[PDB]
Symmetry: none
Amino acid sequence: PYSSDTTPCCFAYIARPLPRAHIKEYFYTSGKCSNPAVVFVTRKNRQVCANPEKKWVREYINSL
Amino acid sequence: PYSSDTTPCCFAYIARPLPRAHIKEYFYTSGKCSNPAVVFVTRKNRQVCANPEKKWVREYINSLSMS
Amino acid sequence: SDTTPCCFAYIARPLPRAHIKEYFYTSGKCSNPAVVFVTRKNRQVCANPEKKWVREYINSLSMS
Amino acid sequence: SDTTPCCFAYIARPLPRAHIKEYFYTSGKCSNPAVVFVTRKNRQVCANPEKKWVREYINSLSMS
Amino acid sequence: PYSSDTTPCCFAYIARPLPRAHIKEYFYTSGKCSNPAVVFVTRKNRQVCANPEKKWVREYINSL
Amino acid sequence: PYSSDTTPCCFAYIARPLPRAHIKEYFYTSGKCSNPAVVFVTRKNRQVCANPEKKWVREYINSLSMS
């Protein structure tokens, strides 16, 4: 661990793929967090936690 | 209350009291987080992690809280 | 004593993510550090831990 | 590169011959020389090549 | 290879166990030979080639 | 003719001709053996491996052989 700022962590992963077209960016959550996660940021700026191992997650990252 | 939303967690606690005058709100971090924490939100919207057990932290919560 | 897998060379071309099931790091007893990717047919592939592709694959995989 | 099994310690008590299916020598790439006995449950057991019992077992086994 | 003397080699292994009681000594054939073998020497001094991996061979060696 | 009996094989060939006078019999080693050889049996029953291709070896066989 490293800073007093908060950092976003994920504790569950979205079940249904989000539409590819609705995603504006992604990031991986901090290594400080207990679980690994991809966060997708939608065009409406919602942050959505997703399982880095899922195929659709990988396909999105690779294509976007 | 496990959802897909991100949740803010804390990994370190500010060393010095923040000025009371600059704080507008607080909240506690989720119990899912590995460490307990209070977060103070400043008027400039910075979120500052703080040690729940410190006296100043408790005094500030007691001044903000409607409970 | 049980055996442990060690690596002596690192794959040159990235193998496809789709063919990998998990990874692990080789033992610190080994002379070289290495990531091992375990394929669908359970072949163990040694890879250079410092490579960007290797790191990106690890982020999307579970560790055995 | 594929992994190869290496040994870092040698079993103290002889395991029963009846439980061993085959042996092999570890790679010369490994830092220590070793005989590996492969048990009926496919556990790999490292053993000291210089030991009389080890040599006697090898004489009665096929080499993978 | 090492000497002008002949050395006994085996090219087949006896199918039926010899009676334990009829064996006076054993030896392993030379490493120069292409196949490994146990030779049992009977009380009548017949030399009988046997498979070192067979259980009865091992049991005889262990008991005698 | 694969049996359980041992069969004598040769791995080296005597460097110098044996004295003809000391040899009573010969035979060839089995084709199963990795190297070809002639074996001379001395009157004292030593078996001596010899290179089949050497002239002295051939001369000695020709003197012993009834073929």
